[PDB]
Scaffold this motif. Structure first.
Motif, PDB file in Angstrom:
ATOM      1  N   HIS A   1      85.856  21.429  14.512  1.00  0.00           N
ATOM      2  CA  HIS A   1      85.890  22.674  13.744  1.00  0.00           C
ATOM      3  C   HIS A   1      84.480  23.099  13.361  1.00  0.00           C
ATOM      4  O   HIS A   1      83.753  22.342  12.706  1.00  0.00           O
ATOM      5  CB  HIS A   1      86.724  22.517  12.474  1.00  0.00           C
ATOM      6  CG  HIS A   1      88.173  22.252  12.719  1.00  0.00           C
ATOM      7  ND1 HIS A   1      88.701  20.978  12.760  1.00  0.00           N
ATOM      8  CD2 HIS A   1      89.209  23.099  12.929  1.00  0.00           C
ATOM      9  CE1 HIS A   1      90.002  21.054  12.991  1.00  0.00           C
ATOM     10  NE2 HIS A   1      90.335  22.329  13.087  1.00  0.00           N
TER      11      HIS A   1
ATOM     12  N   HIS B   1      99.467  31.405   2.946  1.00  0.00           N
ATOM     13  CA  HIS B   1      98.653  31.121   4.115  1.00  0.00           C
ATOM     14  C   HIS B   1      98.788  32.282   5.088  1.00  0.00           C
ATOM     15  O   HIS B   1      99.904  32.725   5.379  1.00  0.00           O
ATOM     16  CB  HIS B   1      99.066  29.813   4.796  1.00  0.00           C
ATOM     17  CG  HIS B   1      98.188  29.456   5.954  1.00  0.00           C
ATOM     18  ND1 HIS B   1      96.826  29.283   5.819  1.00  0.00           N
ATOM     19  CD2 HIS B   1      98.462  29.279   7.271  1.00  0.00           C
ATOM     20  CE1 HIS B   1      96.301  29.004   6.999  1.00  0.00           C
ATOM     21  NE2 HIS B   1      97.272  28.994   7.896  1.00  0.00           N
TER      22      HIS B   1
ATOM     23  N   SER C   1      98.049  33.321   8.877  1.00  0.00           N
ATOM     24  CA  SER C   1      97.743  32.860  10.233  1.00  0.00           C
ATOM     25  C   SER C   1      97.501  34.067  11.125  1.00  0.00           C
ATOM     26  O   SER C   1      98.349  34.957  11.191  1.00  0.00           O
ATOM     27  CB  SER C   1      98.894  32.042  10.840  1.00  0.00           C
ATOM     28  OG  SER C   1      98.772  30.651  10.613  1.00  0.00           O
TER      29      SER C   1
ATOM     30  N   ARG D   1      96.259  35.490  15.091  1.00  0.00           N
ATOM     31  CA  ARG D   1      96.077  35.193  16.508  1.00  0.00           C
ATOM     32  C   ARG D   1      95.680  36.474  17.216  1.00  0.00           C
ATOM     33  O   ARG D   1      96.191  37.546  16.887  1.00  0.00           O
ATOM     34  CB  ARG D   1      97.362  34.641  17.150  1.00  0.00           C
ATOM     35  CG  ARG D   1      97.867  33.319  16.579  1.00  0.00           C
ATOM     36  CD  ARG D   1      96.942  32.159  16.907  1.00  0.00           C
ATOM     37  NE  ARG D   1      97.489  30.876  16.451  1.00  0.00           N
ATOM     38  CZ  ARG D   1      97.354  30.386  15.218  1.00  0.00           C
ATOM     39  NH1 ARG D   1      96.668  31.056  14.283  1.00  0.00           N
ATOM     40  NH2 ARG D   1      97.895  29.206  14.923  1.00  0.00           N
TER      41      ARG D   1
ATOM     42  N   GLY E   1      88.539  31.042   7.842  1.00  0.00           N
ATOM     43  CA  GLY E   1      87.738  30.779   9.018  1.00  0.00           C
ATOM     44  C   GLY E   1      88.615  30.330  10.167  1.00  0.00           C
ATOM     45  O   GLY E   1      89.846  30.275  10.064  1.00  0.00           O
TER      46      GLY E   1
ATOM     47  N   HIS F   1      88.712  30.315  14.720  1.00  0.00           N
ATOM     48  CA  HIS F   1      88.229  30.627  16.055  1.00  0.00           C
ATOM     49  C   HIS F   1      88.386  32.107  16.360  1.00  0.00           C
ATOM     50  O   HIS F   1      89.215  32.791  15.751  1.00  0.00           O
ATOM     51  CB  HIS F   1      88.999  29.817  17.114  1.00  0.00           C
ATOM     52  CG  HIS F   1      89.179  28.377  16.757  1.00  0.00           C
ATOM     53  ND1 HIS F   1      88.130  27.485  16.709  1.00  0.00           N
ATOM     54  CD2 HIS F   1      90.289  27.672  16.425  1.00  0.00           C
ATOM     55  CE1 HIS F   1      88.585  26.294  16.362  1.00  0.00           C
ATOM     56  NE2 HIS F   1      89.893  26.378  16.194  1.00  0.00           N
TER      57      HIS F   1
ATOM     58  N   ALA G   1      92.714  32.040  13.737  1.00  0.00           N
ATOM     59  CA  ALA G   1      91.989  31.842  12.486  1.00  0.00           C
ATOM     60  C   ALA G   1      92.951  32.065  11.328  1.00  0.00           C
ATOM     61  O   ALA G   1      94.052  32.589  11.504  1.00  0.00           O
ATOM     62  CB  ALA G   1      90.786  32.777  12.384  1.00  0.00           C
ATOM     63  N   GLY G   2      92.525  31.661  10.132  1.00  0.00           N
ATOM     64  CA  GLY G   2      93.421  31.727   8.994  1.00  0.00           C
ATOM     65  C   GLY G   2      92.683  31.841   7.682  1.00  0.00           C
ATOM     66  O   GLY G   2      91.467  31.666   7.606  1.00  0.00           O
TER      67      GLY G   2
END
Ligand SMILES: Nc1ncnc2c1ncn2[C@@H]1O[C@H](COP(=O)(O)O)[C@@H](O)[C@H]1O
Ligand SMILES: Nc1ncnc2c1ncn2[C@@H]1O[C@H](COP(=O)(O)O)[C@@H](O)[C@H]1O
Ligand SMILES: Nc1ncnc2c1ncn2[C@@H]1O[C@H](COP(=O)(O)O)[C@@H](O)[C@H]1O
Ligand SMILES: Nc1ncnc2c1ncn2[C@@H]1O[C@H](COP(=O)(O)O)[C@@H](O)[C@H]1O
Ligand SMILES: [Cl-]
Ligand SMILES: [Cl-]
Ligand SMILES: [Cl-]
Ligand SMILES: [Cl-]
Lengths: 323, 323
Positions: free
Chosen positions: A108, A266, A268, A270, A287, A289, A293-294
């Motif tokens: 990560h 949370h 999420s 994509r 943070g 990718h 990311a989330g």
């Protein structure tokens, strides 16, 4: 920043080692913890594995899963934390960071470098790929069970070779592990073919609340805490839901808001082709990718989080479209 | 039975070649047809590709998909039929079998060996793996587009490396193709992330009709033709549904009965661990693999087919449990 060689030296120098993963463990956590633990044991070291969390049901049939302890009774010389980006993610074991020299091994890019030694390499799709290379550097011999366990994290963190992080090095590692006896079908069956009926009902709730924006290019939905309870579900049961929303034709960004436990939201995110969801996540305090990311909020109404996140996402998405 | 070498010689000896796939083409059909067609063109041969069927939407963005013609105007020296187990599966091109020497290349053990030369090898998961080896034997140089096209069939026929046919040779081939530029993420996105909203509604119909038997170890459901029409769907839209039923916790055998067109009932069977669905399929007049097999009835009420198939499946399943 240390590289693999310095981590290998440090691992070689200590013989009583506690390997720790993060709470809410996923395939890469279970894979990295068990692969490194078993590798180090083959060098004769005294090693325990620990995760301050209940192991999810889908891992219960994997070999050596019982080696991961919630409450180990161990006085380690060295703490090795794998796949955890920050000390809060290892639960009660963060107390050891003040008392025991620590090694961090993680893919990560968000890792806070909280170990005395830190090997953090975001070019790997999975921490499991780093453990694979550490084990080989140490001289560990793989059998089929160790190969299966190390394959697990590479498969899960690439969506079983579907995501954009499945590069030539991922496929090479998978090939090498299957050649050494990794049971790829066993891993897929245990991870992907243990769906609860309640999970279909929970996803039906997601579809009922689904909203499209920007000519179908943005899709979002939510699960509030009462809805999880109504379906005897937790956030373990909604794993993979956000990817199902991404899989809708024409959708570029999918966002799923999940309240679990109460008041803990949370987010999420994509993306499919081009939109960098990590930039949105980072700006909101999370943070991840570019394509996954989330963000996690504590103490907020879902009615407040949803429009703030969607507002930021729309602003960024419209900017990206303008190039 | 000819091997690869005899097929390679025959391909080398003819320069005007029609490559034909089967109706209702899947990833392996599209992959094998285009990979062989492009490979043979790189040897300078005059090659056309043909499939007597509309190309499904998920293939429309693949490179060279327009090379597959429904109505070619070509007088071939040689017919090469790939991934089609019997002449009826190639539609109107079966007429050429009487006029033109033919080569069959196929991984299906059900292949009737209807070519003048036949290379049929069920140890491959995908015909695409056989085309890969033929192209290399011929001296073809892969670029990224050809690698992507040849990767396609290996991925789709293994469920993207999830099914029991994903053995070391599958992973080796995938690695070699990704090393040559195969875009694994592109393939996953086009095949798996083009879902229609109507497909979620159609699967909700499947779940409403779902029935479990034998302590949850058998799951079956059905889609009648009126239900396909009601949701603006065809049997292209129910691809992957039967695997979703297999993915339910504790299910060993999943069966989906699909009526499309009217009165044509296709039975798709999947097993998880141990039950050989191909033996049930064969006894009913179909065939396939131990873990994935099917039967197709013409001229029957779904009310007749369902209890007859379930009856046979229950008898065989109870026998297997007794070992
Ligand atoms: N392009 C991508 N890169 C990384 N993870 C991705 C991804 N697309 C989807 N994902 C998913 O996001 C999660 C990333 O986990 P993180 O690295 O802890 C995994 O579940 C992974 O399958
Ligand atoms: N609040 C957060 N802060 C930093 N990284 C996060 C995050 N939430 C998720 N991520 C990372 O983003 C990726 C996607 O997370 P998720 O599966 O929860 O959508 C994972 O690799 C995860 O580690
Ligand atoms: N063990 C298995 N072997 C082969 N195909 C399997 C399988 N489990 C599921 N399948 C699926 O069944 C189909 C087989 O196609 P057939 O070879 O034309 C593919 O869609 C494949 O993904
Ligand atoms: N009627 C039939 N006769 C012979 N093989 C069949 C068949 N129906 C399906 N198969 C084979 O069984 C596997 C599973 O088929 P399906 O995806 O349609 O469930 C495929 O490899 C397919 O080629
Ligand atoms: Cl064990
Ligand atoms: Cl990154
Ligand atoms: Cl093109
Ligand atoms: Cl077979």
């Amino acid at each position: 920043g240390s590289g693999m060689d310095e981590i290998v030296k440090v691992l070689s120098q200590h013989d009583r080692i506690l390997v720790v993963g993060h709470i809410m463990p996923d395939g890469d956590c279970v894979s990295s913890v068990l692969s490194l633990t078993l590798g180090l044991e083959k060098l004769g070291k005294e090693v325990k594995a620990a995760v301050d969390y209940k192991i999810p049901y889908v891992f219960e049939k994997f070999p050596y899963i019982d080696k991961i302890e919630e409450n180990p009774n161990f006085d380690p010389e060295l703490l090795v934390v794998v796949n955890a980006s920050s000390p809060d993610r290892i639960g009660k074991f963060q107390d050891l960071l003040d008392k025991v020299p620590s090694v961090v091994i993680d893919h990560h890019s968000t890792n806070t470098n909280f170990g005395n030694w830190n090997w953090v390499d975001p070019s790997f799709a999975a921490t499991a790929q780093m453990i694979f290379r550490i084990n080989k550097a140490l001289g560990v011999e793989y059998d089929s069970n160790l190969a299966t366990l190390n394959y697990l994290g590479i498969a899960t963190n690439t969506g079983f070779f579907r995501h954009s992080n499945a590069d030539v090095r991922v496929f090479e590692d998978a090939y090498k592990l299957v050649k050494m006896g990794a049971d790829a079908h066993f891993v897929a069956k245990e991870i992907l073919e243990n769906k609860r009926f309640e999970q279909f009902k929970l996803f039906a709730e997601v579809l009922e609340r689904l909203q499209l924006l920007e000519n179908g290019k943005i899709a979002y939905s939510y699960i509030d805490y009462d809805t999880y309870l109504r379906h005897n579900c937790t956030d373990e049961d909604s794993a993979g839901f956000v990817g199902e929303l991404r899989s809708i034709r024409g959708v570029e960004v999918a966002v799923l808001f999940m309240e679990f436990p109460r008041g803990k939201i949370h987010v999420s995110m994509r993306s499919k082709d081009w939109f960098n969801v990590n930039e949105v996540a980072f700006e909101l305090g999370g943070g991840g990718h570019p394509r996954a990311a989330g963000v996690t909020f504590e103490g907020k109404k879902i009615e407040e989080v949803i429009p703030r996140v969607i507002n930021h996402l729309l602003k960024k998405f419209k900017e990206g479209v303008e190039s």
